[PDB]
Amino acid sequence: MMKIGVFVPIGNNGWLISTHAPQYMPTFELNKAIVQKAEHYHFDFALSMIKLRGFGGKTEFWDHNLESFTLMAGLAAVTSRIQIYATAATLTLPPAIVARMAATIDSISGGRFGVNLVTGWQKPEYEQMGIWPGDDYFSRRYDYLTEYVQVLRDLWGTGKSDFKGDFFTMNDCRVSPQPSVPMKVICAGQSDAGMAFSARYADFNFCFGKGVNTPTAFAPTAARMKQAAEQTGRDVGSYVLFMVIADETDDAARAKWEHYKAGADEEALSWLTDPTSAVNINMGTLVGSYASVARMLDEVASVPGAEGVLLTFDDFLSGIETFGERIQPLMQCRAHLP
Ligand SMILES: Cc1cc2nc3c(=O)[nH]c(=O)nc-3n(C[C@H](O)[C@H](O)[C@H](O)COP(=O)(O)O)c2cc1C
């Protein structure tokens, strides 16, 4: 039994850095079509990242990015069942503002909203607007995030905070209304510090899938996350990020993957710096027939600590359709759906 989410393309061209990949801008209407089709095929959740600066090149890769809370507020208004997660770049928003935005999208969605809390680590995204705290941030960022989430938990739990720390001073800070359901916090910590944060404050932790057609290769990461969760006694499972490149046959899927690699936008790859390829930021990739991808996702579901997968596709509109019509019906870990 495994949850499935869609990582919505809030940035241009999704997760392929290639002149041979589909070229598209992130629009509301594209993300609306993607999330409504994901909801139709019983995807459990939709998440958007936040990406405040791109990598340029021929494809202007991630030069064009919408903002995560406003995108997800719009998507909440045109959905009814799928869970909706926005990402907070915690250097860019005061916690009381995130608290109130989360209560707002709770109201829009009827209790289907959560927040992905990130420290940020790419200095230029912050330096460009004069808000990088300096190179001490690399080591202290989970101290900062710990204070941030304490403020969030106070406001969502009681409506008020008197929290006083190194980074925040709350003087009877108020945020009402409080969310109608317990607010879900998710984290994407890979480091020991990040997983220790997730074990204390997250409902679940996102990690990277690893390799091409080695679906269980992330297992050591999920094991580290289970060990971190033992230290708090909390049930904090792993949701694993993969790109799915599926077709009618293994050969046809491999032909598309190779076509994408052949178009690699090397100027964009420069800025960013059977093996994984920089063409999708060395993402965990599942490349095969619909049946091969279903088998490989059933293998993810068997890894200790894995509770779900977060999916990108080479083509989201056709990828979600073929996932729902051809892959998901063969998955033992989705036999619970209608
Ligand atoms: C699925 C996923 C989504 C992520 N989304 C973002 C994002 O939107 N913005 C961001 O600054 N970092 C993002 N990250 C980076 C993580 O928050 C984190 O910094 C990274 O996994 C490194 O781990 P560490 O922070 O413990 O070193 C993401 C990571 C993963 C696995």
Return the DSSP state at 332.
G
The answer to whether position 242 is within a domain reads: yes
The answer to whether position 29 is within a domain reads: yes
The answer to whether position 66 is within a domain reads: yes
Q: Per the omega criterion (within 30 degrees of 0), is the bond before 177 cis? A: yes
The residue among 256, 283, 105, 248 whose CA lies nearest residue 181 is: 105
The answer to whether position 338 is within a domain reads: no
Check whether 50 is labelled as a binding-site residue: yes
User: Helix H segments across the chain?
Assistant: 28-40, 68-77, 95-109, 123-127, 137-158, 192-201, 219-230, 250-262, 266-272, 290-300, 316-322
Place of tokens 């050969």: 251
Check whether 12 is labelled as a binding-site residue: no
The answer to whether position 273 is within a domain reads: yes
Q: Which of 4, 45, 49, 204 to mutate to test the pocket of ligand 1 (most atoms within 8 A of CB)?
A: 49
Query: What determination technique applies here?
Result: X-ray
Give the largest CA-CA distance in the chain: 62
The residue among 48, 46, 61, 52 whose CA lies nearest residue 15 is: 61
- Per-residue burial over 145-171, b if 16 or more Cβ lie within 10 Å, else e, is bbbbbbbbbbbbeeeebebeeebbebe
Nearest CA to ligand 1 atom 25: 189
The answer to whether position 245 is within a domain reads: yes
Three-state secondary structure call for residue 13: coil
273: exposed, middle or buried (Cβ count in 10 Å: 0-12, 13-18, 19+)? exposed
What's the CATH number where 67 sits? 3.20.20.30
Three-state secondary structure call for residue 327: helix
| Alpha-carbon span 243 to 144, nearest angstrom | 31
Sign of the CA dihedral with 143 first, then 146, 150, and 152 last: positive
Asked if residues 332 and 298 have their Cβ atoms less than 8 Å apart, the reply is: yes
Amino acid symbol at 37: K
The answer to whether position 125 is within a domain reads: yes
| Strand pairing report for 306-313 and 184-187 | unpaired
The residue among 208, 205, 201, 203 whose CA lies nearest residue 225 is: 205
User: The domain containing residue 274 runs over which residues?
Assistant: 3-333
Number of domains in the chain: 1
